[PDB]
Amino acid sequence: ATAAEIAALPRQKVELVDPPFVHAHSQVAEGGPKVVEFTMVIEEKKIVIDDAGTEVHAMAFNGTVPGPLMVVHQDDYLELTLINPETNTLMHNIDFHAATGALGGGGLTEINPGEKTILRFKATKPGVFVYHCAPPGMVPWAVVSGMNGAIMVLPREGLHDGKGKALTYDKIYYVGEQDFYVPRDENGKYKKYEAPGDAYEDTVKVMRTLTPTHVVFNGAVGALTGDKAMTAAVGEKVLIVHSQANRDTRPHLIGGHGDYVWATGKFNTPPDVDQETWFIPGGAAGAAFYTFQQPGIYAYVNHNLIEAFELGAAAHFKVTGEWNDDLMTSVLAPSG
Amino acid sequence: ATAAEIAALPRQKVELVDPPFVHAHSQVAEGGPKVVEFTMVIEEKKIVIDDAGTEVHAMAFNGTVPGPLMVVHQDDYLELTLINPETNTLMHNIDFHAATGALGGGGLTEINPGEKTILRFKATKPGVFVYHCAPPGMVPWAVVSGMNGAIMVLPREGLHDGKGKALTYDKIYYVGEQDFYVPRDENGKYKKYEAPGDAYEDTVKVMRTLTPTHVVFNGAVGALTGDKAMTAAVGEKVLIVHSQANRDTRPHLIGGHGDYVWATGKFNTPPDVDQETWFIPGGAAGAAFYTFQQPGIYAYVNHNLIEAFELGAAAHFKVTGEWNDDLMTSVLAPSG
Amino acid sequence: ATAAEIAALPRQKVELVDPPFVHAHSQVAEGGPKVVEFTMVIEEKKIVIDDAGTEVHAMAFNGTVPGPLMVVHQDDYLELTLINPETNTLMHNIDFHAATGALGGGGLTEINPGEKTILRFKATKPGVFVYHCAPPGMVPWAVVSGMNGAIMVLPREGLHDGKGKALTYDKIYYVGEQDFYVPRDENGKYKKYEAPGDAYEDTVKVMRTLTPTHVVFNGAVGALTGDKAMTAAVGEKVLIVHSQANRDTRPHLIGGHGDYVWATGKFNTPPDVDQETWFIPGGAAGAAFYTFQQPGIYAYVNHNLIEAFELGAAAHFKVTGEWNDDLMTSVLAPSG
Ligand SMILES: [Cl-]
Ligand SMILES: [Cl-]
Ligand SMILES: [Cl-]
Ligand SMILES: [Cu+2]
Ligand SMILES: [Cu+2]
Ligand SMILES: [Cu+2]
Ligand SMILES: [Cu+2]
Ligand SMILES: [Cu+2]
Ligand SMILES: [Cu+2]
| A245, A270 contact by CB (below 8 A) | no
Q: Cβ contacts (< 8 Å) between B131 and chain A: which residues? A: none
- C-alpha–C-alpha distance, residues A195 and B252, integer Å: 48
What is the identity of the amino acid at B116? Answer: K
Closest CA to C70 of C82, C88, C58, C59: C82
Longest dimension (CA), chain A: 78
Distance from the first to the final alpha carbon of chain C: 75
Closest CA to B174 of B262, B288, B258: B288
Ligand 5 center to residue B144 CA distance, Å? 33
Closest approach of chain A CAs to the CA of B201, in angstroms?
Answer: 12
DSSP A307: H
> Cβ contact (<8 Å) for B97 and A326?
no
Q: Which of B262, B305, B252 is nearest to C104 (CA)?
A: B252
**H/E stretch holding A142:** helix A139-143
Domain with CATH 2.60.40.420 in chain B: 8-155, 156-322
Of the candidates C126, C99, C122, which has an alpha carbon nearest to the alpha carbon of residue C269?
C126
Length of chain C: 336
Q: Taking a C-beta distance cutoff of 8 angstroms, is the pair A99, A105 a contact?
A: yes
Contact state of A277 with B269 under an 8 Å Cβ cutoff: no
Whole-angstrom Cα distance, residue B80 to residue B120? Answer: 6
Residues of C in contact with B190 (CB under 8 A): none
Listed in sequence order, the residues at least 6 apart from B18 whose beta carbon sits closer than 8 Å to its beta carbon are B62, B64, B68
Residue A38: which of A74, A78, A77 has the closest Cα?
A78
Instruction: Please judge whether C305 and A6 are an interchain contact, meaning their C-beta atoms are less than 8 angstroms apart.
Output: no
Which residues in chain B have their CB less than 8 angstroms from residue A263's CB? Answer: 264
Which ligand is nearest to the Cα of residue C94, counting in written order?
8
Q: Which residues contact B7 (CB under 8 A, 6 or more apart)?
A: none
Contact C103, B257 (CB under 8 A): no
The pairing of strands B258-262 and B272-275 is antiparallel
The closest alpha carbon to A172, from A182, A184, A158, belongs to A158
Distance of alpha carbon A216 from alpha carbon A302, whole angstroms: 9
Superfamily of domain B156-322: Cupredoxins -  blue copper proteins (2.60.40.420)
B-contacting residues in A 271-310 (Cβ below 8 Å): 272-279, 293-294, 296-299, 303-310
Resolution of this entry in Å? Answer: 1.8
Residue A164 buriedness (CB in 10 A; 0-12 / 13-18 / 19+): exposed
**CB-count burial class (<10 Å; 0-12, 13-18, 19+) for B239:** buried
How many other C-beta atoms can be found within 10 angstroms of the C-beta atom of residue C282? 27
Supply φ then ψ for residue A181, to 5 degrees. Answer: -130, 85
Phi, psi dihedral angles at C325 (to 5 degrees):
-75, -15
Contact C58, C140 (CB under 8 A): no
Cα–Cα distances in angstroms (integers) from residue B235 to residues A296, B319, C125, in the given order: 50, 10, 17
Q: Are C14 and C22 in contact (CB under 8 A)?
A: no
Beta strands in chain B (DSSP E): 11-13, 35-48, 55-61, 70-73, 77-84, 95-96, 115-122, 127-132, 148-154, 171-180, 214-217, 230-233, 237-244, 251-254, 258-262, 272-275, 284-291, 296-302, 314-320, 328-335
| Helix/strand/coil for B192 | coil
Residue A246 and residue C325: Cβ atoms within 8 Å?
no
- The answer to whether A104 contacts C306, with C-beta atoms less than 8 Å apart, is no
**DSSP state letter for B220:** B
Dihedral-angle region of residue A168 (phi above 0 means left; psi in -120 to 50 means alpha; beta otherwise):
beta
Q: Chain C window 164-223: which residues touch A at a Cβ cutoff of 8 Å?
A: 211
Please judge whether C275 and A285 are an interchain contact, meaning their C-beta atoms are less than 8 angstroms apart. no
Q: Confirm if B134 and B142 have CB atoms less than 8 A apart.
A: yes
Chain B: closest CA distance from residue C100 (Å): 5
Which residues have their alpha-adjacent CB atom under 5 A from ion ligand 1? Answer: A 59, 133, 142, 147
Yes or no, beta carbons of A304 and B284 under 8 Å apart:
no
Q: How many CB atoms lie within 10 A of CB B51?
A: 9
The contacts of residue C4 (CB under 8 Å, 6+ apart) are none
Task: Please list the alpha-helical segments (H only) found in chain B.
Answer: 3-8, 139-143, 200-207, 305-309
CA of A201: how far to CAs of A182, A196, C158, C217, in Å?
11, 10, 50, 26
* Cα gap A242→A253, rounded to integer Å: 12
Closest C-alpha among A114, A113, A111 to residue A134 = A111
Distance of CA A313 to the CA centre of its chain: 13
Report chain C residues whose CB lies below 8 A from the CB of B310. 140, 204, 207-208
Q: How far is the CA of A138 from the centre of ligand 1 (A)?
A: 7
Distance CA C249, CA B180 (A): 24
Cα four-point dihedral sign B273, B275, B280, B284: positive
* Subunit contact B277:C101, Cβ cutoff 8 A: no
Q: Are C150 and C72 a contacting pair, CB within 8 Å?
A: no
How is residue A156 annotated by DSSP?
T
Cβ pair B326:C6 closer than 8 A: yes
User: If you measure from the C-alpha of residue A58 to the centroid of ligand 1, how many angstroms do you get, rounded to a whole number?
Assistant: 8
What single string gives the DSSP state of each residue in A189-257? PBP--SSGGGGHHHHHHHHTTT--SEEEETTBTTTTSGGG-EEEETT-EEEEEEEESSS-B-EEEET--
Query: Between the CA of residue A112 and those of B151, B310, B320, C78, C330, what are the distances in Å?
Result: 56, 49, 69, 56, 16
Read off φ and ψ for residue C47, nearest 5 degrees. -130, 150
Q: Which helix (H) or strand (E) holds A6?
A: helix A3-8
Q: How much distance in Å is there from the Cα of C222 to the middle of ligand 8? A: 25
The residue among C271, C11, C262 whose CA lies nearest residue C152 is C262
Considering only residues 94 to 123 of chain C, which have any Cβ-Cβ distance to chain B shorter than 8 Å?
95, 97-112, 114-122
Q: Are B101 and A274 a contacting pair at CB < 8 A?
A: no
Query: What does the radius of gyration of chain C's CA atoms come to, in whole angstroms?
Result: 20
A328/B1 touch (CB, cutoff 8 Å), yes or no: no
Give the Cα-Cα-Cα angle A229, A290, A233 (nearest 5 degrees): 50
Q: Chains near C, with 3+ CB pairs < 8 A?
A: A, B
Compute, in angstroms, the gap from residue A59 CA to the centroid of ligand 4: 6
* Alpha-carbon gap, residue A229 to A317, rounded angstroms: 5
Using an 8 Å Cβ cutoff, are C86 and C41 in contact?
no
β-partners of residue C239 are: C172, C289
Residue type (1 letter), A19: P
The answer to whether the Cβ–Cβ distance between C309 and A115 falls below 8 Å is no
> C264 in contact with B at a CB cutoff of 8 Å?
yes
Give the distance (Å) from ligand 8 centre to CA of residue C246: 14
Instruction: Reduce the DSSP state of residue B6 to 3 states and report it.
Output: helix
Closest CA to A325 of A302, A294, A298, A299: A294
Rounded to 5 degrees, what are φ and ψ at B205? -65, -40
Question: What is the widest separation between alpha-carbon atoms in chain B?
Answer: 79
Residues 6+ apart with CB under 8 A from C197: C89, C90
Neighbours of chain B (3+ CB pairs under 8 A): A, C
Cβ-Cβ contacts under 8 Å between A and B: the total is: 168
Q: What is the DSSP letter of B197?
A: G
Which of C78, C68, C73, C85 is closest to C105 using CA atoms? Answer: C78
Q: Which of A97, A135, A104 is nearest to A280 (CA)?
A: A97
As a whole number of angstroms, the distance between CA B73 and CA B219 comes to 27
- Which is it for the CA torsion B136, B141, B146, B152, positive or negative? positive
SS (H, E, C) chain C: CCHHHHHHCCEEECCCCCCCCCCCCCCECCCCCCEEEEEEEEEEEEEECCCCCCEEEEEEECCCCCCCCEEEECCCEEEEEEEECCCCCCCECCEECCCCCHHHHHHHCCECCCEEEEEEEECCCCEEEEEECCCCCCHHHHHHCCCEEEEEEECCECEECCCCCEECCCEEEEEEEEEECCCECCCCCECCCCCHHHHHHHHHHHHCCCCCCEEEECCECCCCCHHHCEEEECCCEEEEEEEECCCCECEEEECCCEEEEECCCECCCCCEEEECECCECCCEEEEEEEECCCCEEEEEEECCHHHHHCCCCEEEEEEECCCCCCCEEEEEEEEC
Q: What's the rounded Cα separation, in Å, for the pair B18 and B22?
A: 7
Q: Is B129 helix (H, G, I), strand (E, B) or coil?
A: strand
A6-19 burial string, b = 16+ CB within 10 Å, else e?
A: beeeeebebebebb
Instruction: Determine contact, residues C282/B307, Cβ cutoff 8 Å.
Output: no
Which is nearest to B153 in space by CA: B98, B97, B100?
A: B98
**Nearest by CB: B283 against A250, A255, A331:** A250
- Using DSSP's 3-state secondary structure scheme, residue A143 falls into helix
- Rounded to whole angstroms, the Cα distance separating A44 from B39 reads 56
Which positions in chain B touch C126 (Cβ < 8 Å)?
274
Backbone angles phi, psi at B279, to 5 degrees: -135, 130
- CA distance, residue A143 to nearest chain B CA (Å): 21
Residues in A touching C222 (Cβ below 8 Å): none
Sheet holding B296-302, edge to edge: B230-233, B314-320, B296-302, B251-254
Is-contact C24 C111, C-beta < 8 A? no
Ion ligand 3 contact residues with beta carbon within 5 A: C 59, 133, 142, 147
The two beta strands, A55-61 and A35-48, are antiparallel
Q: Strand C148-154: give its sheet, edge to edge.
A: C70-73, C148-154, C127-132, C95-96
CA C203/CA C218 separation, integer angstroms: 21
**Nearest 5°: CA angle at A69, between A254 and A102?**
125
Burial (CB count within 10 angstroms: exposed 0-12, middle 13-18, buried 19+), residue A234? middle
Beta bridge partners of B260: B273, B289
CATH pick for A8-155 out of 2.60.40.420, 1.10.10.10, 2.40.170.20, 2.40.128.720 = 2.60.40.420
Q: What is the Cα–Cα distance from B208 to B183, expressed in whole angstroms?
A: 12
Three-class SS of residue A261?
strand
- DSSP states of A79-119 as a string? EEEEEE-TT--S-B--EETTS-SGGGGGGG--B-TTEEEEE
Partnered with residue B292 across adjacent β-strands are none
Instruction: Note the residue count of chain B.
Output: 336
**How far does the CA of residue C114 sit from the closest CA of chain B (Å)?**
6
User: What is the CA(A132)–ligand 5 centre distance, in A?
Assistant: 6
Q: Which residues crowd ion ligand 4, with CB under 5 Å?
A: A 59, 92, 133, 142, 147
Q: Give the DSSP H or E segment for A306.
A: helix A305-309
Å from C72 to nearest chain A CA?
Answer: 29
A250 to chain B, any CB pair closer than 8 A? The answer is yes
B134 phi, psi to nearest 5 deg: -155, 75
| CA nearest to C267, candidates A70, A200, A177, B274 | B274
CA within 13 Å, CB half, A331: 20
